[PDB]
Amino acid sequence: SHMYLINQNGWIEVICGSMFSGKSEELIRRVRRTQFAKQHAIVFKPCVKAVPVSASKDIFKHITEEMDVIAIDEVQFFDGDIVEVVQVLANRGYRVIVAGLDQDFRGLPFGQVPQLMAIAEHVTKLQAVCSACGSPASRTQRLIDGEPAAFDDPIILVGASESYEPRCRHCHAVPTKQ
Amino acid sequence: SHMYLINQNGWIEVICGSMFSGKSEELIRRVRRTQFAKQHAIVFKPCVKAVPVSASKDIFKHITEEMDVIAIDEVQFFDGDIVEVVQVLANRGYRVIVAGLDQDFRGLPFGQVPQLMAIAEHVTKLQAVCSACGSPASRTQRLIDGEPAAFDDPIILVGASESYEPRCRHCHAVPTKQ
Amino acid sequence: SHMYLINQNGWIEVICGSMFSGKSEELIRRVRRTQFAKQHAIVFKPCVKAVPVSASKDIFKHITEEMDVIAIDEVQFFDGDIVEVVQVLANRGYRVIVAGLDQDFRGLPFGQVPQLMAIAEHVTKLQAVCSACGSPASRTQRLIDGEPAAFDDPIILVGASESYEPRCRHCHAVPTKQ
Amino acid sequence: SHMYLINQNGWIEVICGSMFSGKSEELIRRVRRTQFAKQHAIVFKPCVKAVPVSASKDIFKHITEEMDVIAIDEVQFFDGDIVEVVQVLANRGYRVIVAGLDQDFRGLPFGQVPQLMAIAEHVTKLQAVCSACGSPASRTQRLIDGEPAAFDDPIILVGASESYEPRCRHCHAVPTKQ
Ligand SMILES: Cc1cn([C@H]2C[C@H](O)[C@@H](CO)O2)c(=O)[nH]c1=O
Ligand SMILES: Cc1cn([C@H]2C[C@H](O)[C@@H](CO)O2)c(=O)[nH]c1=O
Ligand SMILES: Cc1cn([C@H]2C[C@H](O)[C@@H](CO)O2)c(=O)[nH]c1=O
Ligand SMILES: Cc1cn([C@H]2C[C@H](O)[C@@H](CO)O2)c(=O)[nH]c1=O
Ligand SMILES: [Zn+2]
Ligand SMILES: [Zn+2]
Ligand SMILES: [Zn+2]
Ligand SMILES: [Zn+2]
Structure with missing residues (x-):
């Protein structure tokens, strides 16, 4: 049954x-x-x-x-x-x-x-407000010493303002190795 | 012009x-x-x-x-x-x-x-949650000594919890004189 | 009672x-x-x-x-x-x-x-999409022979595309007499 | 780089x-x-x-x-x-x-x-409206000859009204074998 x-x-x-x-x-x-x-x-x-x-x-x-x-x-x-x-x-x-x-x-x-x-x-x-340009954000930007974190850095990293920022997609920057 | x-x-x-x-x-x-x-x-x-x-x-x-x-x-x-x-x-x-x-x-x-x-x-x-029945509220109930305020009492009366409560329309009670 | x-x-x-x-x-x-x-x-x-x-x-x-x-x-x-x-x-x-x-x-x-x-x-x-600029509209523009209707023309006028257009506030034009 | x-x-x-x-x-x-x-x-x-x-x-x-x-x-x-x-x-x-x-x-x-x-x-x-009880639906019910489809029947099956119905979670019925 x-x-x-x-x-x-x-x-x-x-x-x-x-x-x-x-x-x-x-x-x-x-x-x-x-x-x-x-x-x-x-x-x-x-x-x-x-x-x-x-x-x-x-x-x-x-x-x-x-x-x-x-x-x-x-x-x-x-x-x-x-x-x-x-x-x-x-x-x-x-x-x-x-x-x-x-x-x-x-x-x-x-x-x-x-x-x-x-x-x-x-x-x-x-949505938050984008830090770079003031328009609606939809992304979290990770920064390390002012520089955008690479696509290969860990997925999980506990933090706040000292490493993270809200951005629209235009201003979101996730660099990759070639 | x-x-x-x-x-x-x-x-x-x-x-x-x-x-x-x-x-x-x-x-x-x-x-x-x-x-x-x-x-x-x-x-x-x-x-x-x-x-x-x-x-x-x-x-x-x-x-x-x-x-x-x-x-x-x-x-x-x-x-x-x-x-x-x-x-x-x-x-x-x-x-x-x-x-x-x-x-x-x-x-x-x-x-x-x-x-x-x-x-x-x-x-x-x-919407708040209705105090009487727990379903979505859409009204502010005015109470005076536990009793629902009449339709004729002043429009403006500054207050908080001591006089006011959220209710759905079913539970909202605004009595009128006849 | x-x-x-x-x-x-x-x-x-x-x-x-x-x-x-x-x-x-x-x-x-x-x-x-x-x-x-x-x-x-x-x-x-x-x-x-x-x-x-x-x-x-x-x-x-x-x-x-x-x-x-x-x-x-x-x-x-x-x-x-x-x-x-x-x-x-x-x-x-x-x-x-x-x-x-x-x-x-x-x-x-x-x-x-x-x-x-x-x-x-x-x-x-x-919201519609603005005809003038493509961004979100929030206004109805009335046009008469291509020209924006004056603030004094009737409130009610039955019509469609032949007289009306959606616009954002920036592109909305309601001229007044001086 | x-x-x-x-x-x-x-x-x-x-x-x-x-x-x-x-x-x-x-x-x-x-x-x-x-x-x-x-x-x-x-x-x-x-x-x-x-x-x-x-x-x-x-x-x-x-x-x-x-x-x-x-x-x-x-x-x-x-x-x-x-x-x-x-x-x-x-x-x-x-x-x-x-x-x-x-x-x-x-x-x-x-x-x-x-x-x-x-x-x-x-x-x-x-959300649609639930067929069984009239409250907001959030599920698609699959029926076969009036009977709720088992949890093991295929994921994909192309159809319309002849097999499918909207239901709230309460009225949604997905039977499993034991
Ligand atoms: C955006 C992002 C946040 N986080 C962490 C940082 C914060 O501690 C938490 C969000 O409050 O999630 C990640 O671990 N990886 C991510 O990609
Ligand atoms: C519901 C209601 C609130 N109020 C007041 C009480 C509160 O001070 C304020 C809402 O924060 O408005 C009125 O004056 N009249 C009303 O009918
Ligand atoms: C924007 C606007 C529309 N209308 C009419 C035109 C249309 O027949 C109807 C909206 O479908 O309302 C007015 O009468 N006055 C107005 O200011
Ligand atoms: C609910 C559901 C719909 N469908 C199909 C039936 C319809 O052709 C289509 C939704 O329009 O998806 C499935 O294949 N599996 C399902 O679980
Ligand atoms: Zn931006
Ligand atoms: Zn209630
Ligand atoms: Zn515009
Ligand atoms: Zn139901």
Whole structure:
């Protein structure tokens, strides 16, 4: 015979975009509306309380039937389970709100974020303002001593303003070796 | 003869919605992207610095050719000039970002906000979560000692949580005399 | 004593923008999703069937308890009742979808559209592409024999391509007498 | 030495969602605004003119310096090159508009659509109305003789109403063997 688990009407909201676009601020705006309504919310991170986790499946250990809203920040960093983990959470009737980068510094899709964008009921893509020219940005520029990082430098490198900048595609510079 | 002033490509962004929807937080998110880009921003209020003003036309006194972005919060409160003031600012090439309530406590259009929504290049309408039932809110409920305010009580009454609550239309209650 | 009619969770969606932005096409897209779901829809116009009406209150005569979705096109043209008419429809539990111009040819708010934008749960503002320069348009330019219409010519003038064009604010030209 | 090709300010717009959500209609709305502005547009499909192509890289053969806008429908069907092909088109200064399913019938990410959603400047996710319950849909249900298709049936199966239906997640049924 065939098996069928009946999903509940939870859902997923994805917030994504380059660094500096206010993804985390928008996650928190949404979460805050939640509290004015007196719902129970929890926020997860890698490394209302914010709870660090080393694996996606660890999220389960921290959850209750009491809880209404599950937020996860910096999702690009989450492991390969994260797609399944959020699907199951939504299927259980939770509002799952998820924020992370769409693209790494090369302009390539970051981690499981594209998959989350695909399965999500709602997607919000935020833009920053380009540092070089003032028009809408859609990229994170990595700089090293003022110089644009090469296409071959590591995908993951934890940092902030000291290494990163928002740019439109025109101003985005990712040099390759020949 | 006929006169013609050539507008520049400034524009208007309206952020609106009931109390508690995060209008001001979203104004500030937008303004903050501005600073990461090193643009000059100013924020106006009734009663990056926040500058109180008693009339809309007073905004002009505080502006420069240096400045790039003009934000105005709590726009429902601004006088009858505000439509013209923002049109002229945009026409001068500024990015004008404006936040205020769409509706008063009766569910009726608040101040000049509907007109601003009409002339604006961008409109963003934010929703809170309903306090009574947990579904998307689109109204501000006024309560007085737990009781829903009558349709005849003043349009303007400055307050916060001690008198106000977000609700969907179903849960919104505005009683009338007979 | 005080009276209170309990609203149902109907709602309003406003679609607005300059001529040529595809307001009517988007109204119909939405309406069409409705039919794939086997809901009962009706469309109203001034002058699934499209039904002309000379007054807003006339809409009532054409409605049923069977019906689920009420669409109204060219709302700028509707009389002063239209705000109340749509509020009551929503309050009765209908999905009310409404399309019309945000601005007349002068760049001023058109009819009751700003009020509808204020009371609506959802607002969608569509942009066309500017004819003069190719960037996003937000205005309807009126031309008469190639020449930009004066600020004093009538507010209402029924027409299409033979008199009208979409423009950004920079390219929008509304001359005034001196 | 290192190589650097300077991108132009073209961009990508993704339109996605379940079957029946009006993706193609919205592609055409956008394309049509283009024509009112007198820009040169072309539309591509798998199998203003609509041009069938068997490989993504074939798109190049059909393009000019004259052309301004490149639309591609049913993108889930396009091969592994499509991400690169659209990146390069945007990088060359074209407005690239792309429409396809976010999810296959199992609720899993379809083809290269998630990657396109990640690299795109704009993402629009459209919802249909659920056939079973009338609330917003976010899934395509596959039915075979009235019965929900198993999780193991082929990923690709060309069809329309005779096999497919839009549903919310609650009503979506994808049975598995045990
Ligand atoms: C753009 C980018 C950011 N990051 C990191 C830097 C920050 O710590 C984090 C985004 O907040 O992601 C990468 O690891 N790789 C990248 O390509
Ligand atoms: C909803 C509502 C708010 N307000 C006030 C209360 C707050 O001070 C402000 C919104 O932040 O507006 C009114 O004056 N009238 C109203 O109907
Ligand atoms: C822009 C504009 C359009 N119209 C009319 C022309 C069209 O018939 C209709 C929009 O489809 O509105 C006006 O009457 N006044 C205006 O200012
Ligand atoms: C939902 C779904 C649609 N399709 C096909 C059916 C249609 O021909 C096309 C969407 O228009 O994609 C699949 O091949 N697999 C799927 O899972
Ligand atoms: Zn730039
Ligand atoms: Zn409610
Ligand atoms: Zn223009
Ligand atoms: Zn359903």
